Design a binder for this molecule. Structure first.
Ligand SMILES: C[S@@+](CC[C@H](N)C(=O)[O-])C[C@H]1O[C@@H](n2cnc3c(N)ncnc32)[C@H](O)[C@@H]1O
Ligand code: SF4
Ligand SMILES: [Cl-]
Ligand SMILES: [Cl-]
Ligand SMILES: [Cl-]
Ligand SMILES: [K+]
Length: 245
C-alpha cells in the first residue's frame, strides 16, 4: 500500500452550489512562492502518514453531501502531484464510489512516468496555477522556472483534461498588463480550459512564516484594487475565455 503524507483534511461547503468539498491538504511542496498562505506545507518529511483506506473512512461520512452538485473530493496542499501514486489510488477509490475528484496543483511535474496519465484518468477537474508567464518574474516570485508548469499545461490540453486556470494577482508582481496578455495568449487555444479564475492576493497565513522564524517578503503589499482586477480580467477576456474573480 502507498503511504500518503498529509498536513490535514477538512470538509467545507463548495464555493457555489449545494454539497460539500472534502479537501485533503497534502504535505510537501517544492516551490517557494513569496505569498504562500500554507507555509507549513512545504516540508516533504513533515505532516501525518495516512493510507487511502484511512482517507476513505473520513470521506464516506459526508457521502450524502458529495452526491450533491459541486460536491466531491479535492487533493490540495501543498503539492498533491508530488504524491501522484497516492492521489491516483485515492481518486481510484472515489471513482468506485461515484465521487467527483479535483486536483489542485501547481503543475511542477518534473518526470512524465505512467502514474501521471493514470492519475489524470481518474481526475475530473484540474485547477492549475499559472503563477507568472514572465519567467524572469516567476523565478523571483516562486524560486523556480515556470517551464515545467507550462509544459504540464500543454500536456493537459493535449489530453483534453478539464482545467480551471488560477491566476493569483499580486500588486507589483502579477498585476501588470504584459503578464496578463502573455497569460491570455498562452491559454487562448486551450479548449479544455473551462475558465480562468483571478485570485486577488491576501495576506492570510503570514503567521505561518513567522512560526518558522522566516521573514515574510511581501510585508506591506496590499490586496489588488477592484480596478486592477477588472483591468486584468478585461485583458484576459480579449482572448476568448470565460474570466471571473
Ligand atoms: C496553497 S495552494 C495549494 C495548491 C498548489 N500548491 C498551488 O499553489 O497551485 C491553494 C491556492 O491558494 C493560492 N494562494 C496561495 N497563497 C495565496 C495568497 N497569499 N493569496 C491568494 N491566493 C493564494 C494558491 O496560488 C493556490 O491557487
Ligand atoms: S505552490 Fe502552493 S503550496 Fe507551494 S509554495 Fe506556492 S502557494 Fe505554497
Ligand atoms: Cl492548511
Ligand atoms: Cl527523481
Ligand atoms: Cl512531456
Ligand atoms: K492550484
Amino acid at each position: 500500500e502507498v503511504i500518503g503524507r498529509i498536513h490535514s483534511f477538512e470538509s467545507c461547503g463548495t464555493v457555489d452550489g449545494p454539497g460539500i468539498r472534502f479537501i485533503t491538504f497534502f504535505q510537501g511542496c517544492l516551490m517557494r512562492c513569496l505569498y504562500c498562505h500554507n507555509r507549513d506545507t512545504w516540508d516533504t518529511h513533515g505532516g501525518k502518514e495516512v493510507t487511502v483506506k484511512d482517507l476513505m473512512k473520513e470521506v464516506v461520512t459526508y457521502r450524502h453531501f458529495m452526491n450533491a452538485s459541486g460536491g466531491g473530493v479535492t487533493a490540495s496542499g501543498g503539492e498533491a502531484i508530488l504524491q501522484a501514486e497516492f492521489v491516483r489510488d485515492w481518486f481510484r477509490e472515489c471513482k468506485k464510489e461515484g465521487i467527483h475528484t479535483c486536483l489542485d496543483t501547481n503543475g511542477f511535474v518534473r518526470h512524465y512516468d505512467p502514474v501521471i496519465d493514470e492519475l489524470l484518468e481518474v481526475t475530473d477537474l484540474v485547477m492549475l496555477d499559472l503563477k507568472q508567464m514572465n519567467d524572469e518574474i516567476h523565478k523571483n516570485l516562486v524560486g523556480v522556472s515556470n517551464h515545467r508548469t507550462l509544459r504540464f499545461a500543454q500536456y493537459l490540453a493535449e489530453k483534453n483534461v478539464k482545467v480551471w486556470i488560477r491566476y493569483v494577482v499580486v500588486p507589483g508582481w502579477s498585476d501588470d498588463d504584459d503578464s496578463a496578455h502573455r497569460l491570455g495568449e498562452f491559454t487562448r487555444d486551450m479548449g479544455n480550459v473551462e475558465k480562468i479564475e483571478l485570485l486577488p492576493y491576501h495576506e492570510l497565513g503570514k503567521h505561518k512564516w513567522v512560526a518558522m522564524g522566516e521573514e515574510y517578503k511581501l510585508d506591506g503589499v496590499e490586496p489588488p484594487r477592484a480596478e486592477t482586477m477588472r483591468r486584468v480580467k478585461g485583458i484576459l477576456e480579449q482572448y476568448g475565455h470565460k474570466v471571473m474573480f
